[PDB]
Write a protein that binds this ligand. Structure first.
Ligand SMILES: Nc1ncnc2c1ncn2[C@@H]1O[C@H](COP(=O)(O)OP(=O)(O)OP(=O)(O)O)[C@@H](O)[C@H]1O
Ligand SMILES: [Ca+2]
Ligand SMILES: [Ca+2]
Ligand SMILES: [Ca+2]
Lengths: 360, 125
């Protein structure tokens, strides 16, 4: 039976083709002595005696030796499968470097002995999962944000935009402003608490200015949050100030334009004859797209940027933290997908270069 | 690439209307007597083949999604469409059709008017 592994900068999403969700979700981390290693939660718990490392930086695999650990743990610790028994589908970032794709192919065949494998682009899979073959995807996780326009099933490499501002950066920001309010959040253990507050109490404002003013008046935006230690804190304009950074990167001292602009900009880099399709098929994907209010603000933000008669539409599915993984589970499950896999036979004949001709 | 599926071998061989339904992750032909009767719990792939005067064949692919179809069905219809296009040397133009919002062209494939019926085949998840 086919497996699907979706390897993110922050979390690994793993499971079996045909399932409607990933069976295993865990932090993409490898701990070593300051067994000879731990992965995921185990690593985090014994963090005090370990050196922690993230093998994927901004969606790109950057430490091969640590990645094999992740994969091993995935196969043996989480999925409890014998890798040599299952054809395996992996995901990658758009614009993933040539030799990285080759490396992944080599390790699977040479170290794990899979009978077959395949690499697909994360954003494209999201589009598939929403039942579309044409649209532009906004994919934002813990390490990277991209805009990926897609036509009739295939990304358009020239028009893709990458932005190194995402979830981790939002968590760090909420930390700073929250201690600014009088509280104190500096420690890793504290980073963890803020992340939970980031995911529970934050939201995106429809009008950021009014929101600020309305928070300076009454206290109807204010919310209470009980610390692990029992203390209660009161969270204010930070609820909506933290994700504001997605639209105004200047907040964190970034020079890039917000995600509404990078969206408009990717679209305009495409052939004029497809722009309308793009504009009407804006798919949101990944964890950092989960803030309440996010789809309304973007809907507002891009009708302002585009001609007043453009039909515009944002699609933000409740399950979009898993849309990539679900896209893969569907693709690998189809009757017609049989001949798509790269066989061990093909690899032995051609070598790792085969990936460039078998996987777009 | 290169697909071996027997329906793939049959698609676009001659002018006409071919209709397949997505059935638990497979492409299954619809009985020709049932054309136009769509289960609103299911998803379908339609191929419309018209004769060109240059002797070559023109193609239009449309995937139709019912209001109550499951995610695996809507996702698979879309992928099958991409695959059918590629197999046809990318010669097809692709169209997305949503229940209650179909295009005038697609609606015209059905001379006696298309019809909606509740139900469908169960999910493949
Ligand atoms: N409800 C939520 N609201 C806001 N942020 C959330 C929510 N749930 C998860 N996140 C954030 O989403 C991130 C995890 O998302 P995701 O699993 O898509 O990323 P990833 O695949 O590991 O990273 P990347 O795609 O950037 O390489 C974390 O930064 C996390 O705080
Ligand atoms: Ca990701
Ligand atoms: Ca159905
Ligand atoms: Ca085509």
């Amino acid at each position: 039976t086919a497996l699907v592994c979706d390897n993110g900068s922050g979390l690994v999403k793993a499971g079996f083709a045909g399932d409607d969700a990933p069976r295993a979700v865990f932090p993409s981390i490898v701990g070593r002595p300051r067994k000879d290693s731990y992965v995921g939660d185990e690593a985090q718990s014994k963090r005090g005696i370990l050196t922690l490392k993230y093998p994927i930086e901004h969606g790109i695999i950057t430490n091969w030796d640590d990645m094999e650990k992740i994969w091993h743990h995935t196969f043996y610790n989480e999925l409890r499968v014998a890798p040599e028994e299952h054809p395996t589908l992996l995901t990658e970032a758009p614009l993933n470097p040539k030799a990285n794709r080759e490396k992944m192919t080599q390790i699977m065949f040479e170290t794990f002995n899979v009978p077959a494998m395949y690499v697909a682009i994360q954003a494209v899979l999201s589009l598939y999962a929403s039942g579309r073959t044409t649209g532009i995807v906004l994919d934002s996780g813990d390490g990277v944000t991209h805009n990926v326009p897609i036509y009739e099933g295939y990304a358009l490499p020239h028009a893709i935009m990458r932005l190194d501002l995402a979830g981790r950066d939002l968590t760090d920001y909420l930390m700073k402003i929250l201690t600014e309010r009088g509280y104190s959040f500096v420690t890793t253990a504290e980073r963890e608490i803020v992340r939970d507050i980031k995911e529970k109490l934050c939201y995106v404002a429809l009008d950021f200015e009014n929101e600020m003013a309305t928070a300076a008046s009454s206290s109807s935006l204010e919310k209470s949050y009980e610390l692990p230690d029992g203390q209660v804190i009161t969270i204010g304009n930070e609820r909506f100030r933290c994700p504001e950074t997605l639209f105004q990167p200047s907040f964190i001292g970034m020079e890039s334009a917000g995600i509404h602009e990078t969206t408009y900009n990717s679209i305009m880099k495409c052939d004029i004859d497809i722009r309308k399709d793009l504009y009407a098929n804006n798919v949101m994907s990944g964890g950092t797209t989960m803030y309440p209010g996010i789809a309304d603000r973007m809907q507002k933000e891009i009708t302002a940027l585009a001609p007043s008669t453009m039909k515009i539409k944002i699609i933000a599915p409740p399950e979009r933290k898993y849309s990539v993984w679900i896209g893969g589970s569907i693709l690998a499950s189809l009757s017609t997908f049989q001949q798509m896999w790269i066989t061990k036979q093909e690899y032995d004949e051609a070598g790792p270069s085969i990936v460039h001709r078998k996987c777009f | 690439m290169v697909v071996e599926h027997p329906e793939f071998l049959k698609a676009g061989k001659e002018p006409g209307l071919q209709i397949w339904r997505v059935e638990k992750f497979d492409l299954v032909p619809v009985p020709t007597c049932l054309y136009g009767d769509f289960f609103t719990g299911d998803a379908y792939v339609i191929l419309k083949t018209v004769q060109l005067r240059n002797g070559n064949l023109q193609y239009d692919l449309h995937y139709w999604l019912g209001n109550e179809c499951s995610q695996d069905e809507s996702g698979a219809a879309a992928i099958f469409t991409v695959q059918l296009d590629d197999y046809l040397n990318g010669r097809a133009v692709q169209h997305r059709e949503v229940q209650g919002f179909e295009s005038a062209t697609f609606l015209g494939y059905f001379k006696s008017g298309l019809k909606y019926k509740k139900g469908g085949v169960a999910s493949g998840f």
